[PDB]
Amino acid sequence: QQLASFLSGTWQSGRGRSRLIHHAISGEALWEVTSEGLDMAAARQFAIEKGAPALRAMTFIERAAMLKAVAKHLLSEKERFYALSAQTGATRADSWVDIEGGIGTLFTYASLGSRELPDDTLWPEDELIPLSKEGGFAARHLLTSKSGVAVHINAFNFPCWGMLEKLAPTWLGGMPAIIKPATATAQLTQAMVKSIVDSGLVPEGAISLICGSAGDLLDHLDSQDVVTFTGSAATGQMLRVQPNIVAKSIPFTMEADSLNCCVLGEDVTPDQPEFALFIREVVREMTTKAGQKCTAIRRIIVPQALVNAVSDALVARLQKVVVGDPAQEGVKMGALVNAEQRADVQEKVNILLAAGCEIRLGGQADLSAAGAFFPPTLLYCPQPDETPAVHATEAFGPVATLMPAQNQRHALQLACAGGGSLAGTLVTADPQIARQFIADAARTHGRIQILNEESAKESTGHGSPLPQLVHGGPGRAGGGEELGGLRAVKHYMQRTAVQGSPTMLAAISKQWVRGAKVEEDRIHPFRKYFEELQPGDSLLTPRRTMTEADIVNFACLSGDHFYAHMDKIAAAESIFGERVVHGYFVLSAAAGLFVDAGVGPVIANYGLESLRFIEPVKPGDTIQVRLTCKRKTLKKQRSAEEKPTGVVEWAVEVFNQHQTPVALYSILTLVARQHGDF
Amino acid sequence: CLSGDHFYAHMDKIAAAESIFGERVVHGYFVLSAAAGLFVDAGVGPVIANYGLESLRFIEPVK
Amino acid sequence: CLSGDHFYAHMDKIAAAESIFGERVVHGYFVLSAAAGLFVDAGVGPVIANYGLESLRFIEPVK
Amino acid sequence: CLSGDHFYAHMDKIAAAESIFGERVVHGYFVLSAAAGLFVDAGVGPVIANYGLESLRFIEPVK
DSSP, X not given: OEEOEEETTEEEOOOSSOEEEEOTTTOOEEEEEOOTTOOHHHHHHHIIIIIHHHHHHSOHHHHHHHHHHHHHHHHHTHHHHHHHHHTTTOOHHHHHHHHHHHHHHHHHHHHHXXXXXXXXXXXXXXXXXXXXXXXXXXXXXXXXXXXXXXXXEOOSSOTTHHHHHHHHHHHHTTOOEEEEOOGGGHHHHHHHHHHHHHTTOSOTTSEEEOOSOOTTTGGGOOTTOEEEEESOXXXXXXXXXXXXXXXXXXXXXXXXXXXXXXXXXXXXXXXXXXXXXXXXXXXXXXXXXXXXXXXXXEEEEEETTTHHHHXXXXXXXXXXXXXXXXXXXXXXXXXXXXXXXXXXXXXXHHHHHHTTOEEEEOOOOOTTSSSOOOOOEEEEOSOGGGOGGGGXXXXXXXXXXXXEEOTTTHHHHHHHTTSSEEEEEEEOSOHHHHHHHHHHHGGGEEEEEEEOTTGGGTOOOSSOOOTTSOEEOSXXXXXXXXXXXXXXXXXXXXXXXXXXXXXXXXXXXXXXXTTOOOBOOSSOGGGSOGGGOOTTBEEEOOOEEOOHHHHHHHHHHHOOOOHHHHOHHHHHTSSSOSOOOOHHHHHHHHXXXXXXXXXXSEEEEEEEOOEEEOSOOOTTXXXXXXXXXXXXXXXXXXSSSSOOEEEEEEEEEEEOTTSOEEEEEEEEEEEEOSSOOO | OOSOOOOXXXXXXXXXXXSSSOSOOOOHHXXXXXXXXXXXXXXXXXXXXXXXXXOEEOOXXXX | OOSOOOOHHHHOHHHHHTXXXXXXXXXXXXXHHHHXXXXXXXXXXXXXOOOEEOOEEOOSOOO | OOSOOOOHHHHOHXXXXXXXXXXXXXXXXXXXXXXXXXXXXXXXXXXXXOOEEOOEEOOSXXX
16 A cells, blocks of 8 residues: 655656555554655646646635635544544644644634735735835835745654645745655645645645655756755755755755753742643643654753752653553553654663763663553753753653753753754743843744743643744754744745836736825715725815814814813924814814715725824814725625625825825725625 | 714614614714823823824724 | 815815905805894794795805 | 704703694704705815705704
């Protein structure tokens, strides 16, 4: 039963030197894996010539809708994935975090995209940048999709989450993906790829899968492609100097092994709740997935006094963890994935012991039994700041080292001695301690959890990367960045500054910008349905002359008797030099000048985005408004009965009688559409 | 009356009945202005200018 | 504000500058209403209903 | 308040209860003014003057 690869649209396999996938618990070889003789160049050319233009023709809203449909279809079929994850050595909670975290990543990126990305194939990321006096020359930054293919070389830790946390921003960015999982657990990636492909939900050529070796694929990549790697540091650093990748300047992101720490604060004493939640946190991070996640705690740093109490409590809670076959009721932590992995963990543990670490709880495994079980291992380091191997050696299993600190600053130095980590945790009750810790140690950590009694109730964990937070770190952790919300989407696009006149930039952006040509229609823009509106549709309102009576009436009705409006004496020695009109009255009277009263397509306002009061408005001044439709964004119908709407941003400009702007802002609205799309 | 905004969701009982809210509601800008009225200190002091309002969302209708 | 009539001859000094009058004037309907306010007796009496206005001309602008 | 007309049919609940309408009603002149506020176009245009009203009858009371 050889595991197939999905490239060039065909499920196929290879022939030659294979590799076997064994069952983590029983030890039997239940899959063999090979991809020799497969045409990698044809697979890349298939991804780029038909997958990429298909994905690039969709708007960001359509791609977010596709992510959501795929997430739902994957969610329905999750039982198959759970049954396959059983073969990897995982309890049901571990498989839960993997499966449902991957699918939740899809759902989160779908929501984020549909909520924040333009209804277009281009993405203007900032506002218009003015670059001249008269306004004929400006610039803004645009993001467009790269034309190549994204190759994702994943690790065995999270065969589903690791694929989907990269796949979601890749598609949202408009790029096809070629996925190469780790051979040791590729059977679980294959089934998810088959679900996605047999759903018919995604364009053709938008997903490819290489089970086995990548062959000469990297030699065929050009500068419009991207590569991501998760795994050991030697393999990643070898890929980073691949001659083709360096010659063509192909973006390369590496994520490697890190020594994640967990510091206990000096303020913490054993009679506090922080002590108990610290113990629980260390143990959960040590034993989830048998400590096989890249964010598992490897270094425990406590104050010198607390050392013996902490070491009592850790082994106490850690002896009640039953290692065994999770199919048997009573097991709380399963096996590693391989006898090879178990050998590597034992060999790292032996390195640490030879480098001067004392065993507090079992460190020797059964190097001949069938299942790849390892006992929870807790080590001790008596001399932390002269034993360099404890900050460099990472045993990829249920293994951690306890070590003592001093004076609340030695602990910071110890935390930073990791050389760059993915995740760190500080258990404390004092906010000043947490501030000092962040200020000193954020530069060597990608993510830091401050864990006190209040956050502990809903905290997601030290080891769980959330889709909205960056996942990565400097130095030993690889230097890469993932999962930062839309930051990860931008990793698959090109940022380009575009200079020109505001009308050219408005046409390039498909959004109206300041100083661009408008169009007037003698039909009020509020009477138009979403489809009949265009960016740049504009209305000049009639005028309203400000009076002292307006200042008085507004101040009375609102209750705002600030001296700059109601006190002639105090206003005389202000910067304006006399009484002025309220900013909020300019806002309200502008709404009064442009809002169409009758029932129409405009449903709600609900939003005002960036208001600045430029110049004072005085009694005797006369204001006039221009209302220009600035940006449109369709909203997908989530049902069959909800009324189809879209979001329209409107630029508002308030001028006085010298044509000088006195207020600038934008309003958001909901505008009914004529045609829904179920 | 003072602002000139006679949008039907505030001034037309019939049309407001078949809106999503289901009746007439208060203007968002009046909630804004009355909030300023509740918190602004009137006398001369260290505060010199407002000049800016940064990210306003109207969450729930006020009746 | 109360009536909703923001015709430029009353509310826009720039447009009223090049009107026939040359400045902002008072609404004719407010002249009518203020006149009613000046002559109408408030308390219960023999006058029962008003119900009618017959031939109204506005002769000269009120400033 | 603004016009000064405090005829009991609008401002006195006790006297209005004993009237033909049976409760307080809206001023006819306010119906006239608010109607002008509903139909008058504010901005500069072809309409130059108003100056005249011809045959006003108040048919039904407005509550």
